[PDB]
Write a protein that binds this ligand. Structure first.
Ligand SMILES: Nc1nc2c(ncn2[C@@H]2O[C@H](COP(=O)(O)OP(=O)(O)O)[C@@H](O)[C@H]2O)c(=O)[nH]1
Ligand code: BEF
Ligand SMILES: [Mg+2]
Lengths: 364, 172
């Protein structure tokens, strides 16, 4: 087989409807191999390119992009939907690059895959459109997951006490994280993207937790410091279990970790002051002084942080040149970098299941 | 993950004897030659099988330093096991075992399972604490005994396996 897909011009809207507009992420045939709609879409583009039909190439690509935009505008607040079409848009972009005919994108191609490259059309401009589209989808993905995690963080990371041995707990957050990760993995999202999403989620957890520390006196004690450190340790072990220790997610928690440490360490002598300054390099001077100010003990034999100690801290942190930041922007989104991940999938072997409702498509 | 038992285990002993690396070796198979003094309290978990049951070890870690009594109380609170660690190449850390035993008796439950651990057994050429001397002290004071090397991993799994099993014998 050639590895193309033929369809009548009158069936283009029918094609985009079932494959994009009304396609279900949890489809049995869709969960055989990842990115199947993306592969099917590209196989049609090849035939259009093979037919030297510039009008069909233009219409199909236009119908494709607009159909993806439509689903994400309708089913906007669904994680699985956004996750699925982020994965497939990227894979559709992968195909357009991998089979572009450009030497820079064919370094990992087989001899037969190179025979499947486009021969008549330069779709460089269309690849830029999808690239920018992919950015918007990722942005939308982050917003959806942020809206779910945000109400769980304060209750689960701070208020719920377990260190001494319905509302949200740490396990609630852990379960939600597992759900997010499992869905993205099932869709076969690029691992580079998954890691960036996880990093984004951990920053959200860290920033919101740390902001509450910097705003609440009833959260600044050594006991709370221990609780926070344990909670973070659970998040770290989740990262390790999921093989995500290179995602950057752990490093985003470093300001929170050092704040939890600051709550626990001694705060009286000049050695204590020097230790604090050497320890809190991921916290700003304003943040450090704030925690020391908000530090409200809950036992009898322990005194509050003196004004003399705080002055000592500010004196030592005078020569440091750091950010003036106090509260963190919990809404901040790290700029996403998109990988190019060509596959070994042989287009001539790809079959189209009957459950997709695409029988009108001829396999060329 | 699921478990049948949750055992809180604490690590105690002089600074530098290798408590934190025993933790890292057991819970994540990692070791650091350049590990620094532990700040506040650290935590790590691992589940093992004992008598067909899943036992989740919740291991607490802290520096061998002086601190507010309330923090020490919180550290020992609910602990069912304890690794009392010294450095076989540093006799002073073994001499101070009595001090840590005293802290144990002052803060821990009377039925806490205690294992005396001689760490850094890889430093054979530098041994300052005879195995027979330490074992005799352990037996005399109702402690289990083992020598480990967090560095080359010798007996680290066995140490935790044994103390978790002895706890299981008591609480199951
Ligand atoms: N040779 C050797 N060195 C070790 C061993 N365990 C720990 N160390 C070293 O001893 C130093 C103190 O270790 P650490 O775990 O931080 O001691 P802690 O204060 O009890 O937690 C570190 O430099 C470790 O690399 C061991 O089994 N053998
Ligand atoms: F210095 Be160790 F952590 F006791
Ligand atoms: Mg330590």
């Amino acid at each position: 087989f050639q590895g193309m897909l033929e369809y009548k011009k009158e069936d283009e809207q029918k094609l985009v409807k079932n494959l994009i507009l009304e396609l279900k992420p949890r489809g049995v045939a869709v969960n055989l191999i990842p990115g199947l709609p993306a592969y099917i879409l590209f196989m049609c583009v090849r035939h259009a390119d093979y037919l030297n039909d510039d009008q069909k190439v233009r219409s199909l690509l236009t119908s494709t992009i607009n159909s993806i935009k439509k689903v994400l505008k309708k089913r906007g607040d669904d994680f699985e939907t956004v996750s699925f079409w982020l994965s497939n848009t990227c894979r559709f972009l992968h195909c357009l690059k991998q089979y572009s005919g450009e030497e820079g994108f064919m370094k990992h191609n087989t001899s037969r895959q190179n025979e499947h490259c486009l021969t008549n059309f330069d779709l460089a401009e269309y690849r830029q459109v999808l690239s920018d589209l992919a950015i918007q989808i990722y942005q939308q993905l982050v917003r959806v997951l942020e809206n779910i995690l945000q109400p769980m963080i304060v209750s689960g990371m701070l208020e719920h006490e377990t260190i001494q041995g319905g509302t949200y707990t740490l396990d609630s957050i852990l379960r939600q994280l597992n759900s997010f990760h499992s869905v993205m993995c099932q869709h076969g999202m690029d691992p580079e993207l998954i890691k960036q999403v996880v990093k984004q989620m951990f920053y959200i957890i860290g920033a919101i937790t740390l902001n509450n520390l910097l705003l609440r006196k009833d959260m600044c004690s050594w006991s709370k410091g221990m609780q926070i450190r344990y909670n973070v340790s659970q998040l770290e072990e989740w990262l390790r279990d999921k093989n995500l220790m290179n995602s950057g997610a752990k490093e985003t928690l470093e300001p929170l970790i050092q704040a939890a440490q600051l709550l626990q360490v001694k705060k009286k002598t000049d050695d204590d002051a020097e230790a604090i300054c050497s320890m809190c390099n991921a916290l700003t001077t304003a943040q450090i002084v704030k925690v020391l100010n908000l530090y409200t003990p809950v036992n009898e034999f322990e005194e509050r942080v003196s004004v003399s100690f705080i002055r000592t801290i500010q004196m030592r942190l005078r020569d440091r040149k750091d950010s003036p930041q106090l509260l963190m922007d919990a809404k901040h989104i790290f700029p996403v970098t998109f990988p190019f991940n060509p596959s070994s999938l042989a287009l001539e072997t790809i079959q189209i299941p009957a459950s997709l409702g695409l029988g009108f498509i001829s396999r060329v | 993950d699921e478990y049948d038992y949750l055992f809180k285990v604490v690590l105690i002993g002089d600074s530098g004897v290798g408590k934190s690396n025993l933790l890292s070796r057991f819970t994540r198979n990692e070791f650091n030659l350049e590990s620094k003094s532990t700040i506040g309290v650290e935590f790590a978990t691992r589940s093992i099988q004992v008598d067909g049951k899943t036992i989740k070890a919740q291991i607490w870690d802290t520096a061998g330093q002086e601190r507010y009594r309330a923090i020490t109380s919180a550290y020992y609170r609910g602990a069912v096991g304890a690794l009392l660690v010294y450095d076989i190449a540093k006799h002073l850390t073994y001499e101070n075992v009595e001090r840590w035993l005293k802290e144990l008796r002052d803060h821990a439950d009377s039925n806490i399972v205690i294992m005396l651990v001689g760490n850094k057994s890889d430093l054979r050429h530098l041994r300052a604490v005879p195995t027979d001397e330490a074992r005799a002290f352990a037996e005399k004071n109702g402690l289990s005994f083992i020598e480990t090397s967090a560095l080359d991993s010798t007996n680290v799994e066995a140490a935790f396996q044994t103390i978790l099993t002895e706890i299981y014998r008591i609480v199951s």
